């Protein structure tokens, strides 16, 4: 439970002191308390930081993202140990039945197609939308660049939450790490993809840099979930922790996200 998404763009040095992140540039200096921080995004290559700070950023389970020189995200910090004792959930994950993984993965993919449909309906394609519901009972441009940026953001969120629960992200429910080190996050974030799709659609006319900014909306906006308006990361935490429960067979019924 922190709330700030701290984005860094300026030639600077990040430090740690008394539970604060310490930011130093010309002549801007700034202290921010770690408990307030949800995400730290390192947008540029001109930034310098300390292993002390990174240890503490991992302690407080802060999402840390790194970027390339075109300011696209290329990776994140992946903690090894995401709770006490995470070992308990590990032995359970290895026990996940093939049949159950199926029920859950399919239930989730279904929520996605539903949300794609709702999105289409919302754009007055009543027809094409209804066609996707039918399916459910059964290149290289600015638009994709933004879609992908957005999906990477969603990915890093669920990756985080999964690790915290004591799971490994490498093991997808259908594909179990064959392609990716993060398939399981990729699987859990499926129903949330349309959240990006909406934002990008709305700004489909704009240049890439404007889509990138409008996408930070995900971290500020609030979305209907379990009858309450909640922030995206809080949803992700509940959704993830609850999905993990039904895969362990401590409950029945996958949680639902609708747009």
């Amino acid at each position: 439970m922190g709330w700030r998404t701290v984005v860094v763009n300026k030639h600077s040095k990040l430090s740690y002191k008394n539970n604060h992140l310490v930011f130093k540039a010309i002549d801007h200096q700034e202290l921010i308390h770690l408990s307030e921080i949800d995400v730290l995004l390192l947008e540029t290559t001109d930034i310098s930081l300390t292993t002390m700070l990174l240890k503490r950023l991992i302690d407080e389970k802060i999402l840390v993202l790194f970027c390339d020189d075109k300011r696209l995200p290329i990776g994140k910090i992946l903690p090894f140990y995401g709770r006490h004792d995470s070992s308990l959930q590990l032995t359970r994950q290895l026990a996940w039945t093939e049949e159950r993984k199926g029920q859950v993965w399919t239930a989730i993919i279904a929520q996605k197609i539903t949300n794609q449909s709702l999105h289409l309906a919302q754009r007055d394609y009543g027809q094409k939308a209804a066609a996707l519901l039918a399916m459910r009972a059964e290149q290289e441009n600015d638009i994709n660049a933004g879609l992908n940026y957005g999906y990477t953001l969603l990915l890093s969120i669920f990756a985080r939450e999964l690790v915290q629960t004591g799971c490994f992200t490498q093991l997808g429910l259908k594909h179990a790490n064959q392609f990716n080190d993060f398939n399981l996050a990729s699987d859990l974030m499926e129903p949330f993809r349309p959240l990006v799709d909406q934002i990008i659609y709305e700004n489909r006319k704009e240049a890439f840099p404007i889509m990138k900014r409008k996408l930070f909306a995900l971290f500020m906006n609030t979305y209907m979930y379990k009858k309450k308006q909640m922030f995206l990361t809080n949803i992700a935490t509940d959704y993830t922790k609850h999905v993990v429960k039904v895969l362990n067979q401590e409950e029945e019924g996958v949680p639902e996200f609708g747009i």
């Binding site: 709330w3 998404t5 763009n9 300026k10 008394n18």
Partner: protein, 108 residues
């Protein structure tokens, strides 16, 4: 009314008379900094809190780190109130730590 991004206002006058007294103060003031309080003015600190639960939590922590010295006093101000702070003279602290906005740029 709201308290949404409320602001806890902590005010102390603590004795300096003896070295135990001073030690107790330094410990307490450290606790405060570590807990993310901002010095607004000399004996006067403020911590932005997210909702009421965060507050009852913070109060419990304060009570545990109570130095048992002096006059230490807390007030709950609403975000609205605190941002309406009239500056009769001198100017505001423009730290990010002192705003309540979720998205923050270090040079945008």
């Amino acid at each position: 009314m709201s308290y949404r991004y409320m602001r806890l206002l902590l005010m102390f006058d603590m004795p300096t008379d003896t070295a135990s007294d001073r030690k107790a103060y330094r410990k307490f003031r450290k606790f405060l900094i570590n807990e993310g309080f901002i010095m607004h003015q000399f004996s006067v600190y403020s911590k932005i809190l997210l909702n009421d639960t965060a507050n009852k939590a913070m109060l419990a922590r304060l009570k545990q780190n109570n130095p048992q010295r002096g006059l230490i006093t807390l007030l709950n101000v609403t975000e609205k109130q605190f941002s309406r702070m009239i500056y009769l003279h001198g100017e505001q602290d423009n730290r990010v730590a002192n705003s309540d906005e979720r998205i923050v740029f270090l040079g945008e």
